[PDB]
Design a protein around this nucleic acid. Sequence first.
RNA 1: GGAAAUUAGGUGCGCUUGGCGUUUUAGAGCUAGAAAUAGCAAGUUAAAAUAAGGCUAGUCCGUUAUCAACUUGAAAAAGUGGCACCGAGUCGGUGCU
DNA 2: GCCAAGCGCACCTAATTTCC
Length: 1301
Amino acid sequence: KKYSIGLAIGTNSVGWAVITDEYKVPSKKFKVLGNTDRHSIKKNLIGALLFDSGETAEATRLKRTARRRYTRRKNRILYLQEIFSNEMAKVDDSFFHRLEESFLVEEDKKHERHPIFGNIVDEVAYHEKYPTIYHLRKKLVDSTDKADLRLIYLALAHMIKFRGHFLIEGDLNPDNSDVDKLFIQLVQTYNQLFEENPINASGVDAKAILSARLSKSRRLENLIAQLPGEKKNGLFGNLIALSLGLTPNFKSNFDLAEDAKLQLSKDTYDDDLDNLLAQIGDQYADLFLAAKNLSDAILLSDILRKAPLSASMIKRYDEHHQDLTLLKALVRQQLPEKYKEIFFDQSKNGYAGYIDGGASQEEFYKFIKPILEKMDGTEELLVKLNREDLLRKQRTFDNGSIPHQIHLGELHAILRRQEDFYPFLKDNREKIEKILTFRIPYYVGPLARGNSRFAWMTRKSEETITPWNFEEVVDKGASAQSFIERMTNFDKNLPNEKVLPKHSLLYEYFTVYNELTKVKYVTEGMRKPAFLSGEQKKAIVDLLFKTNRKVTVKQLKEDYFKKIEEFDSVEISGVEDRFNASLGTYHDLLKIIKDKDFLDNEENEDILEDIVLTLTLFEDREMIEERLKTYAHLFDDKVMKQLKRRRYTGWGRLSRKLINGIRDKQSGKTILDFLKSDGFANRNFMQLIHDDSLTFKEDIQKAQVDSLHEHIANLAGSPAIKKGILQTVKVVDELVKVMGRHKPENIVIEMARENQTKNSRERMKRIEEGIKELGSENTQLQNEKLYLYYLQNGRDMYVDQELDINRLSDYDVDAIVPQSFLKDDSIDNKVLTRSDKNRGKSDNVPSEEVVKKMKNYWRQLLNAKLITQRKFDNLTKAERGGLSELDKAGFIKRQLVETRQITKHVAQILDSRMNTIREVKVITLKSKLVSDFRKDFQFYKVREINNYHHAHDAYLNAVVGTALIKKYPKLESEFVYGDYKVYIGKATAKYFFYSNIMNFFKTIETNGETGEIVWDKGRDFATVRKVLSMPQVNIVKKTEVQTGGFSKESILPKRNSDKLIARKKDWDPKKYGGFDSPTVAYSVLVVAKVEKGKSKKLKSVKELLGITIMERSSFEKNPIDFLEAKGYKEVKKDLIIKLPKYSLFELENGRKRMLASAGELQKGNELALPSKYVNFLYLASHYPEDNEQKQLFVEQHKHYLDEIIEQISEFSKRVILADANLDKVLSAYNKHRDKPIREQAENIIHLFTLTNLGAPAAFKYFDTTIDRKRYTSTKEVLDATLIHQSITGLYETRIDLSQLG
RNA sequence: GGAAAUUAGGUGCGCUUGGCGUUUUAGAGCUAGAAAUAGCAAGUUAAAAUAAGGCUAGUCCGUUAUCAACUUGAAAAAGUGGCACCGAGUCGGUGCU
DNA sequence: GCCAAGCGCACCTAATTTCC
């Protein structure tokens, strides 16, 4: 018999069904294993596998990094404590000890409870003189008096432990603090360079503008606005932006050919500036210096106002005191009835909650704001609140802007002050400072000893790596090299050959000749088009591609064919407007080394290939020098300086051994040789690789030498969908064994599209960058119309006119490619215009009329990067011919056939495992075909009822899939791999996919092309309806061992209960608090004896123990010792059953339960509603007129509202066993019986949350809501029937646990 | 179906790094009462931990993927369950071997 | 439990040119 298999792949489900020629679902008796009275059972060959989602590795990685950083932060302190160890023991012997015990309660604390000095008197005095750490810091920076070494350590430790960011490479100058004096100095040096066009900085408040709390882009706009006739994209405008921390491009300001982007924070700025000044002149040298100095002043004034930061923290502390003192007074005098709630009540978001409650600054401001407004004399207070500078703490969320240089400055100062009084401080100055400054390079990674699967570093020595001897022990080279070599692709054609750099000389030679060998030309003398020749190819490369970075068709026509070969009229094919491939690297090195004869000499191909490789591999200037030491004799000093800066990025798709190369046997030529000259053939790369006349094909296939899991894991795509793919393959494989190892006829796959789950800042940056290129709040950009308004510079996209910023609601949002052809609603296919009719045709790409008029305006937006390249091409698609009638057909075809790559991988895998010439055909459809089939023939789907619809979708897929391929034999739907046979009527093709493909279903007996019965409207319709009416479907919930975090991450306060988890072994929760809610990995059946106190006797028990994630490693190593440690003796090891989550149990009257944990159960049954009630619920919930009115009649005619309630009731009273809940359901039901059917049926659907398989959840009926009732007892399970299910659920082993007492 | 180039967007994997949060303790609360309770004073900071912990002791590892049961394999993983027919409230019945 | 910065590599999507 010939059977077919349908598949519905989701992120949490795999639907599957087996189907015969009559479109029916087979039945089979399956063997039942175990110790039960059941030996066989009848099951339909249809079902669904449900599972929890696959997770990404992101959360695991973030925590992995955080673990390393906590370890390394602690080490930094230890490094500092080591240096202080000797001299501290003389001053205080237990100081360091009191620090590492500070967390302990006074009882547990071995030493005296005062960490700093060890007595109450000195300790109180300290906090009295130094309320904050910044008071001490600022003190030690300025004062020249000998200070306590303990106070010196804590000041330095505080700097080390919280050292600030590393976003700014290099030092900053403390002297540059005056924003105005440096601004004027910046303007003056500008006017010195440009007397013809001076800048008046008379009435500009630079400090108020540049140090404003607004964005860099906003502050840039503010300052330029005060300057008449000055542009933001202007030279001075770009100088300000550089000073603000932005990255401007001076390429336009100096009419340069290449980019000249500068950023002061970047480590390569000094070289990029020297690169720029080399071209524009050293007359702008002290101009960028003046801009540099200004940025030093802007940076300081923003985050602070000899120890600027600490002093700024002190001022904040002082003003906090002032404003608090005033705040209490105004309350005592005006609102005394609110004083208790504000300053004593932690529960409220007042000052009390702000200090001791845990309320945030934002929550505190919102609460105290109306209070301030009600009172008077709060004018100076509310202005601070709106400026977010009212009653601020020192340690807050915005301290992240503080560079490490500033903490370093204070640290450096303190060490200098006490360098004389304390000896070892003078020697460890560079040493202590290094602890603060040292940052492990990203290209080095973890400093492992070969025990880390993430590490790649290689050491020079066996010594312990420290911040001081890092370069001595660590080989930066082999570490940085390995960093890139471990990620770079290998050639697919030559699996053992590493791929070439993207900017390789040979590579660009390849790309150019590959394109060049396929262009054609027609002159007046020839009647037929011809390929270029070897001599012609060599000339063009010599004269065009080596004399210009890019080559246009016009350049090919004029500069070559007309100028060199004396041809007036020439027409070029195989290339449009300009060549895609180019020789960029060649022109780069040409400008650098200034030796053309050296470059054109193929004798130095290996040399230049080695240079580009090292420039692509390494970024560090010091690493470049060591890798270019062999070429010191070839280039002068100035040449090497320009070559070290030239660093490339990116890697190609082909290896060197492949391109030039393996030689063909007879010809002796490499692939590149063929691309240079191939007589009349001019075969391109794809033709050479597949040519059986050549030996490239054989050499490649002989070069190619993996588990299914690993292959799937390596595929791109979400781990959620990849998980479903693996289970799909297992379902199919088991189904084959079910069908006696016989392959199916067809496999029809339907894969659901996944869901769409900082953005305003991303959108705001693309606007600011676009406006500045045109010379024209963040949360507001959420709206599509407003966002497009700025994207279109307040102008129409179809008409040359300005749009009103108010009547946005009165204007239209249009789609470039009509919604009928493509299902795209993104901004890449969206346009804000005044009218729909201004686009021209309503069934096509915007007319050539509006294209010819708006082409320029669009290009301006394109060059301003306000619109995508793709969006541009779609806007002007009518210029190239517009949407063809075949294109219209293609868009309809691609609505039925899946296009996604990840789906093609599933089809490819199943095609490789089934066909071993082609026995099985793999078909991949979209959900549209089945969905329309359900809507057309009233096979309505209601997901909230049960999970059967997953199996239904799979069933309907195989039906529609195999019937369409039988009725109309075409293979644009069936998957083919590597066996592609390269080889009007579109009006019919468009009409074909538009209707006729589903029409042969509509109505009597449809036949195939050669007398083959395909669809019988008399019987096959009832067959499908019968299938969807089957009460038995194999629904399997994939049982899984829970992994991940030990518990919830929230550390709870101390409590008297013993439910809390200890954060450390010695930290009892009663005194220190801890975690709650431990996560259970899996449960274990335990049949043993337990001591029944206090008789010291034994009583045999049968219990369910939950093995938590934390305990799992301990348990699995030695379970019997583990169980004995918890009070379980006389343990029957043979009765230890592993019970992961979702383990299935059957009880009385067929009710099933699944394990959610060792103490909670879930509902294990499905409510199989008849199809009649299903269609009624769909229609009544959704409320051609001649066709829609008739369906409204049956809706009105039927009284099913009372019958569905009876269905749920019978199910609930039998299986759900929720007495109190169900009674509230029935009472609230008839309560709203007066409400219309649409309002009734829509709430009836909500009621199925009561009967849904899985975890109990709350559901509401109108205004009446119902709390969820979960099963908090697992005692029932112990005397029930455990059911081990295979992935399909067809093969099951059931264990009667009642015989294990 | 697949490959290369050109433009761009987007997603992931890995590394390096900053700032919060949380938890315990330190920062002597005072006065009036026999005490529960009132009147006030005060609050901004720090230490330490930040999965338990582990060994190979590294400035390393510690939350992804994968997992029914029963037989096998170092492993990857591979093996193990008779077929039609008639019905349908979760699968049942009848018949063949 | 959250927010933020930087670097590299790989992949997918989406139109053009040339091919298998």
